[PDB]
Amino acid sequence: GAITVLHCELTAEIGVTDSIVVSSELVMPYTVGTWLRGVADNWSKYSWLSVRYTYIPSCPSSTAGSIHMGFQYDMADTVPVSVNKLSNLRGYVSGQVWSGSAGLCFINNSRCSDTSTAISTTLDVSELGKKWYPYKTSADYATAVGVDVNIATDLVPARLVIALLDGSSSTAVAAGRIYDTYTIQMIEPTASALNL
Amino acid sequence: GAITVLHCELTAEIGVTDSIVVSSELVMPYTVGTWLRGVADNWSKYSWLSVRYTYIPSCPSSTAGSIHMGFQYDMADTVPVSVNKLSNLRGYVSGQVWSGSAGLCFINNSRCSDTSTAISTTLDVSELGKKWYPYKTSADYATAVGVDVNIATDLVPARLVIALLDGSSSTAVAAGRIYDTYTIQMIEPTASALNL
Amino acid sequence: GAITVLHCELTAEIGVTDSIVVSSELVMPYTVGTWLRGVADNWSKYSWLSVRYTYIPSCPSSTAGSIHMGFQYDMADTVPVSVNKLSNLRGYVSGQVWSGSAGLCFINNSRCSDTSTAISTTLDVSELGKKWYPYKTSADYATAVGVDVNIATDLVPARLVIALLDGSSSTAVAAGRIYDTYTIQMIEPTASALNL
Amino acid sequence: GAITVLHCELTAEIGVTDSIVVSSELVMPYTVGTWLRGVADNWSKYSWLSVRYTYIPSCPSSTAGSIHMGFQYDMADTVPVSVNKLSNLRGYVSGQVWSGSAGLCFINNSRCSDTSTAISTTLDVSELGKKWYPYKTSADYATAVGVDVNIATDLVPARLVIALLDGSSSTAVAAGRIYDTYTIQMIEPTASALNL
Amino acid sequence: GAITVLHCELTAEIGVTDSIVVSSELVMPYTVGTWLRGVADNWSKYSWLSVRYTYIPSCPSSTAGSIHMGFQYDMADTVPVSVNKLSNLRGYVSGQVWSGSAGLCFINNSRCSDTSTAISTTLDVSELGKKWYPYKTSADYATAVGVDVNIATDLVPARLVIALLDGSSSTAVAAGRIYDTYTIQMIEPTASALNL
Amino acid sequence: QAGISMAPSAQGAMVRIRNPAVSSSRGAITVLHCELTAEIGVTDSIVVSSELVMPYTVGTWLRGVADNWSKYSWLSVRYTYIPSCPSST
């Protein structure tokens, strides 16, 4: 009954400016990437076997700026407001917007050489609070969270906080992209139209 | 520690009309049936070890109509509106409203040889959200869900949806009944009067 | 590499009249059913590991009519025009429009003892033209075949022909439904929107 | 040397009236059915390795009538005129005109568990007159037998007699069909046009 | 389900003149010979296990002329226009119209002595592009090929090019015959009338 | 030498038939022999001919010997063609 998918897809496009810009992505099928969003909808519940976010650069070596990533686990906790608080989170990694190429091996599965320079981080699936979560659409999530954020705890495993700053322009400059590489188990099918 | 009970009881009475009529039942002690609702209330939490719904006919071989059953696990998902949509659910099982007698052996657990025609489905007890669920009353559940449906995922493991159509009359004709056969582990006793 | 799915879903709804009515269904993801059509589109090619069509009744034991099924493999061959001609095909299977319930166990894969009466046929997955077929949409297929039918052999492995006759009314009476149970391997992911 | 074929095809269509109607079919390639008649003609002689006639219903459970089958081996013997007389033949098998679905598994050779109700009989292929019989056409056979019936024993191994009665109408009602499942060895090729 | 036939039959009659005459035969059941054409039609698809073309003489030792044979595999490629191009093809063999008698042993299966003088060539079944091809009638093939020859690739495995020349008469003189000796596997039966 | 053939002007074959071999086992009596069975001639159009394979018609000697027994069974029957014309025919 468990049907397993392994895949790496574009999860977010990154631009860097001269000011801190904190953003976050829920670590659930619907938000992880559009491809998964579409396939996972045909199933009622899932379990993350492995989730790794890897940043791959697209800018010139002359591009100033740094990216910082880390995880949060209680949606009710406040999202880091400074890059300082961010550095306290689990899974913190911080790189420079033009580096990270060695991480490419995580995206195309070829054998990785030295990945100490890859700006990549992974989710601690075993310390998550439950193994089988329900597939949620961001819309429905939003509504729930609107009543009380604590309703999110039963619905989503974690949140990926990203921070970009130290750039040189007041206007966004294309830095790179964050790709997500996951192994997921999907169970109990459903027509997607009913999945909220 | 745990106190295990295996039992069978009437869970619902069924009637066929000439138009689709989808209905559902929460898979929790309180609603599985009267007897279980009663004994289960003396414990605080429980865990399903086995749950099986078996439809048994009571109409003549000439009764037009068909029955359909399946499970859903995110109380927030839309309930099916058609046989096609329903056929996708886990544990889907369809059949003539006058068929299904072979499932009798599941009820008074005897030797089941002829079970290829039994209109009986089983809950995937291991892929459920968690192990120990709290005993809830229809009333309390109802209120919670009235705030936000997602508050339900923390309380009920699944719901059985039932659809009946293909009947001959626009007014309901008696078809059969759905019986539930479960094995449940209960823990943390409480005076029933306190249990909501 | 490959991603394997085993699933069951409604594939077609059936009605009997008093005259032969041969119809057919391509044995490809897009037409096997709605759910598969949906998930299969996210992959470029696929391979059937198993395909089984099972007819399940919904009429009274007094309903006149019979159902017939079989497979054809050269889309260019003429489709049968009679039961005799049809009885020759591979996987031929005939039966009373009100019979067939024993095939339920194939649908929610249980222990199948009583399957001698199941009006269910299976595709000879190994003698198919090739292993990996491309995912095609009804639209695209249609156009290709409109140029020359033989363009189809490179795209679809087979078609299931269905014939219903021996009914009592000249106007269609609801008989039952055909469900499809498959196991399929999919490869070479693609955003579904690009898949024709 | 020998070329072996195992196949199933429609052999005859059946109807019940309110009076006995005994009919018979020669157990030879030409008359077993259209398909075999066609391929068998390309060989000079043949040998039955297995021959099985299975009746499959297409009427409502409320159809009155019964079917009877048996084999005869001396074309000169008188054909039965009653059920009593017929019940004595080898391979006798009787049943309700609306019964017999369990024999489906013989047709598309699956696992036959429920075969106690199959109205299906088998030819005693080893006690036949000889092993290799010549392929004859109805026409040629007919003429020979018109001279003297005994000329038939050298050409046909047996004939299946079918009797239908106990119907409700004096005018024929559609009951079911008889299908033939054989395994045959053919030898000594010939252009079909020469084969009489 | 695979039914196997082994047979040798006349495939083409040969006449020799004083000018090059190139001809070709599709290596498919329908064109290989009339006997096979007729039997193979009762099946939907086939696979060649072995195909060998052997020329047997019928003229006097005083008959001048030579026969040349070879294979082509992409129906879209141009048919050799000279005997030169022909000698480049796979399976090329060239003999003299009155010789080749030793090849008789391929036709009647008797043990062959020295066949170095037999004008015979065989098809490389393993390098064919697919194993199971659909049975096609030359008519339907023609139509397909009329739209675009490339449609032939999916339909036929190869083509046998034959060239006859060096004769002594402007008018054809009977030289010999080409017999085809094959082992074929036929699958998925069909009434022949539907086979195109 | 492999692949080479030489058409002769005419082929020669000296037929010399030996004495029939007859012997009685227990119940069965067995004969072994050769007999000229048919004469052959060609034309420009096809001419089909047939010969029943039964003692009476297989050979003139066999015909008279086999007649002294009620039934028979063929252990082996072979027809061999020997030419009597040149390779120019």
Ligand SMILES: [Ca+2]
């Ligand atoms: Ca929880």
Ligand SMILES: [Ca+2]
């Ligand atoms: Ca959902």
Ligand SMILES: [Ca+2]
């Ligand atoms: Ca409680």
Ligand SMILES: [Ca+2]
């Ligand atoms: Ca495609």
Ligand SMILES: [Ca+2]
């Ligand atoms: Ca004949």
Ligand SMILES: [Ca+2]
């Ligand atoms: Ca192809």
Ligand SMILES: [Ca+2]
């Ligand atoms: Ca064909």
